[PDB]
Write a protein that binds this ligand. Structure first.
Ligand SMILES: *[C@@H]1O[C@H](CO)[C@@H](O[C@@H]2O[C@H](CO)[C@@H](O)[C@H](O)[C@H]2NC(C)=O)[C@H](O)[C@H]1NC(C)=O
Ligand SMILES: *[C@@H]1O[C@H](CO)[C@@H](O)[C@H](O)[C@H]1NC(C)=O
Ligand SMILES: [Cl-]
Ligand SMILES: [Cl-]
Ligand SMILES: [Cl-]
Ligand SMILES: [Cl-]
Ligand SMILES: [Cl-]
Length: 328
């Protein structure tokens, strides 16, 4: 059976530059550096590496807190350049594949599950962690991430909402991202974390995730705590291209999103959407549970050779947030 991801706490009462240090000390930084060094060489184009290396300090002015400070803190503790630490944190914003599911059972309770896939040789499975971010000793929100990565592709605000992000690949990622960063747009995984931290309820989270300027396109899957509180937000950098909510009155008790626009067919080369829908159809609304979602997310090719982890969560039952490493 897949093992649960290591769980750690991160205190938001500590300043950004030191928050992650207690967590980093549990890891072999030789492994982390080797992994970060590999990603730069593998995922960052040469012209980007040259450019950011020279202008990182000018770019830092336009980046938001506390993300820069947390990256700066990981710079010093690992003897890595600020440019390289920033680049790795941007490299994982793209080339990440996913399946996200938000669904409503017969009682109107909301369930949320997702797979995250990375199609390159990696040590992400060894660096995946569930993190509880604390304010005054209390859990403000929970997220799943990789050691050294300050954004959240997956997270939960207890008794409020759950969020997962799927990449929306429209090409020219680095060209548009750099220009967007200098215009104070933010990474898609950083917006998820900022939403988990700030938004007071599901409705407010959907608004913030739908409208905040981004450096790239993305799909945001959001689940709430009341019946019908589930939505797929298809984003472009400036705003929402499409808002796709649960619609039980019309028989739509789930929404599936992989990495493609739902109003178009999934590509024949990569049709994880069809498999997920059939498994949900076979499971049935009456049998929907977090465990049932985990089983759906274990069906090939929804579950595939590149799957890093599987997360199931329900904001109404925050204690059930569970991330399991796949293919370990
Ligand atoms: C991670 O943070 C949680 C939340 O603050 C910690 O749980 C608290 O632990 C103290 C001491 O055991 C208790 O007095 C609190 O009531 C606990 N609260 C909850 C909700 O569990 C947890 O101990 C922290 N983990 C570690 C390893 O320190
Ligand atoms: C799912 O079920 C609905 C209703 O039963 C059906 O119309 C649809 O074709 C099914 N889709 C798949 C992929 O099984
Ligand atoms: Cl923000
Ligand atoms: Cl935060
Ligand atoms: Cl309903
Ligand atoms: Cl899709
Ligand atoms: Cl459940």
């Amino acid at each position: 059976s897949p093992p649960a991801a290591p769980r750690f706490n991160v205190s938001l009462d500590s300043v950004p530059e030191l928050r992650w240090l207690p967590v980093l000390r549990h890891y072999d930084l030789d492994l982390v550096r080797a992994a970060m060094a590999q990603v730069i060489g593998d995922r960052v184009p040469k012209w980007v590496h040259v450019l950011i290396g020279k202008v990182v300090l000018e770019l830092e002015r336009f980046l938001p807190q506390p993300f820069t400070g947390e990256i700066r803190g990981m710079c010093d503790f690992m003897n890595l350049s600020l440019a390289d630490a920033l680049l790795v944190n941007l490299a994982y914003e793209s080339s990440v594949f996913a399946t996200s599911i938000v669904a409503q059972d017969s009682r109107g309770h909301i369930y949320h599950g997702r797979n995250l896939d990375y199609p390159f040789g990696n040590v992400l499975r060894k660096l995946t962690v569930d993190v509880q971010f604390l304010k005054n000793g209390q859990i403000a929100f929970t997220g799943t991430t990789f050691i050294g990565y300050v954004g959240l592709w997956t997270g939960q605000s207890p008794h409020k909402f759950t969020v997962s992000g799927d990449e929306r690949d429209k090409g020219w990622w680095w060209e548009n991202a750099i220009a967007a960063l200098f215009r104070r747009h933010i990474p898609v995984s950083w917006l998820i974390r900022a939403t988990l931290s700030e938004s007071e309820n599901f409705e407010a989270a959907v608004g913030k995730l739908a409208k905040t300027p981004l450096i790239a396109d993305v799909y945001y899957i959001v689940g709430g705590t009341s019946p019908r509180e589930g939505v797929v937000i298809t984003r472009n950098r400036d705003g929402p291209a499409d808002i796709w909510p649960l619609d039980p009155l019309n028989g739509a008790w789930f929404r599936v999103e992989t990495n493609y626009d739902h109003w178009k067919p999934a590509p024949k080369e990569d049709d994880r959407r069809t498999s997920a829908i059939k498994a949900l159809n076979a499971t049935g609304q009456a049998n929907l549970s977090l465990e049932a979602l985990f089983q759906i997310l274990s069906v090939v090719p929804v579950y595939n050779n590149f799957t890093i982890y599987t997360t199931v969560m329900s904001a109404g039952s925050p204690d059930k947030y569970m991330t399991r490493i796949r293919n370990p």
